[PDB]
Design a protein around this nucleic acid. Structure first.
Ligand SMILES: Nc1ncnc2c1ncn2[C@@H]1O[C@H](COP(=O)(O)OP(=O)(O)O)[C@@H](O)[C@H]1O
Ligand code: VO4
Ligand SMILES: [Mn+2]
Length: 451
RNA sequence: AGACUAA
């Protein structure tokens, strides 16, 4: 037993059994990361199990570190700076870090136990990592624990919370506003506002600042500096991307959730390409997770969740399902077996097994294009599978006329490393490298030979 | 778009 806050002294023997995969689907705020996880880690340490803990984002990693503080854990994330003795048997890293490791030259430790927090995360690297882990368990090589308040098949956006939540539907602004949304700024407590993009976040945060509001912006780009400010400091608004969707303990009073996102989609209407579709409704799991950032405190009884619109359950056209298979078809167990996807996530797209398997140098290029090139999975796969090497940028210029990239209505031109001026006209189109202007600048650098 | 940055 335990009291609130402290880890249970009793841990089920059942969960460490090779061949066992445990899904702990407790409601948000139940204590999965900060009470249950420490109990498992302590017990795995006593059993001398080679253990891996996986967080979706640096936010969840930072929450884990607070709960696991004092235990011999090797943190493999820039969210946590720590003395690594080298003799730790517990590793902690992000989901995508682990998939990256699985795809790279270096060998992953043969973990006896794997704990994945937020095991519903639909990031393609996360789905791929789940495929590998469930294959290790089936092979009797590991035991695994998948922790998630919203496991695959979840459709309720309003699950159980520690404290009552007032759910309110109102219109929520997507951009700056000058009038009409007084309810946003008249509110007394602390607000977490989810935004579909960093750009949209900048706009909104700007707008609240000129209303005398103390605003912390949170994203991949501002995490290191801004996250501790949400902990140790007092603030009015956190304007945040999905970096904060899971795990975060903001101690806030209100969530604002427009329930919108931009989604990458692979088109098959003609030549295959990726577009950024939307804004479209988030999935019920995301709406549930975002709402779950409040009503976490039993002593604080009038938390608010202000939302707009219904969520959308169907995400079969999202690129991540295909991209997860592209990654997984190129990961191998030490026995030589290619993993299959985690059970519940099979047949999300109708993809022939092993149809994304790349040969030799092609697999190395694929990885290079993602890790060094910063290119999406799909584009990286298209380039790699065509037999192009990482440094060969000719594909960026040899597409059909319809592939010409435009910026401010002008045909984008590239000056190459050799001083050639070429029109940017890639053989494969992925809107993720050209839609946002900063993404396009990066892709111009890539096409130039400067990455 | 968002997330990841390890060995
Ligand atoms: N640093 C902290 N100080 C005080 N209370 C906290 C802190 N972090 C989390 N809590 C509380 O402890 C409970 C468990 O949190 P957590 O383990 O993150 O839940 P879960 O991961 O299952 O959503 C939550 O209700 C939260 O309000
Ligand atoms: O189950 V949670 O750590 O996303 O509140
Ligand atoms: Mn958690």
């Amino acid at each position: 037993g335990s009291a609130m806050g402290e880890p249970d002294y009793e841990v089920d023997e059942d969960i460490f059994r090779k061949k066992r995969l445990t899904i702990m689907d407790l409601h948000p705020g139940a204590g999965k990361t900060k009470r249950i996880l420490p109990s498992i880690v302590r017990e795995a340490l006593k059993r001398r199990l080679r253990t891996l803990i996986l967080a979706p984002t640096r936010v969840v990693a930072a929450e884990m570190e607070e709960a696991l503080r004092g235990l011999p854990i090797r943190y493999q994330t820039p969210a946590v700076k720590s003395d690594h003795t080298g003799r730790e048997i517990v590793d902690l890293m992000c989901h995508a870090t682990f998939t990256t490791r699985l795809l790279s030259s270096t060998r992953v430790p043969n973990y006896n136990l794997i704990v994945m927090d937020e095991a519903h995360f639909t990031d393609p690297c996360s789905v791929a990592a789940r495929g590998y882990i469930s294959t290790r368990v089936e092979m009797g090589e590991a035991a695994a624990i998948f922790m998630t308040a919203t496991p695959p098949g979840s459709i309720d956006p309003f699950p159980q919370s520690n404290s009552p939540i007032e759910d309110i539907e109102r219109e929520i602004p997507e951009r700056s506003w000058n009038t009409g949304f007084d309810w946003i700024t008249d509110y007394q407590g602390k607000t977490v506002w989810f935004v579909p993009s960093i750009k949209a976040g900048n706009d909104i945060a700007n707008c609240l600042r000129k209303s005398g509001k103390r605003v912390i912006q949170l994203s991949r780009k501002t995490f290191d500096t801004e996250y501790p400010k949400t902990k140790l400091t007092d603030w009015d608004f956190v304007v945040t991307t999905d970096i904060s969707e899971m795990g975060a303990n903001f101690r806030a009073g209100r969530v604002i959730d427009p329930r919108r996102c931009l989604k990458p989609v692979i088109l098959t209407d003609g030549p295959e390409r990726v577009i950024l579709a939307g804004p479209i409704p988030v999935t019920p799991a995301s709406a549930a997770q975002r709402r779950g950032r409040i009503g976490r405190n039993p002593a604080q009884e009038d938390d608010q969740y202000v939302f707009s619109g219904d969520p959308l359950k169907n995400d079969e056209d999202h690129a991540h399902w295909t991209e997860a298979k592209m990654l997984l078809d190129n990961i191998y167990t030490p026995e030589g077996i290619i993993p299959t996807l985690f059970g519940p996530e099979r047949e999300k797209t109708q993809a022939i097994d092993g149809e994304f398997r790349l040969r030799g140098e092609q697999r190395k290029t694929f990885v290079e294009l993602m890790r060094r090139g910063d290119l999406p999975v799909w584009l990286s796969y298209k380039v790699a599978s065509a037999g192009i090497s990482y440094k060969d940028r000719e594909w960026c210029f040899t597409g059909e006329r319809n592939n010409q990239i435009l910026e401010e209505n002008m045909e984008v031109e590239i000056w190459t490393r050799e001083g050639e001026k070429k029109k940017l006209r890639p053989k494969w189109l992925d809107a993720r490298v050209y839609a946002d202007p900063m993404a396009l600048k990066d892709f111009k650098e890539f096409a130039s030979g400067r990455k």
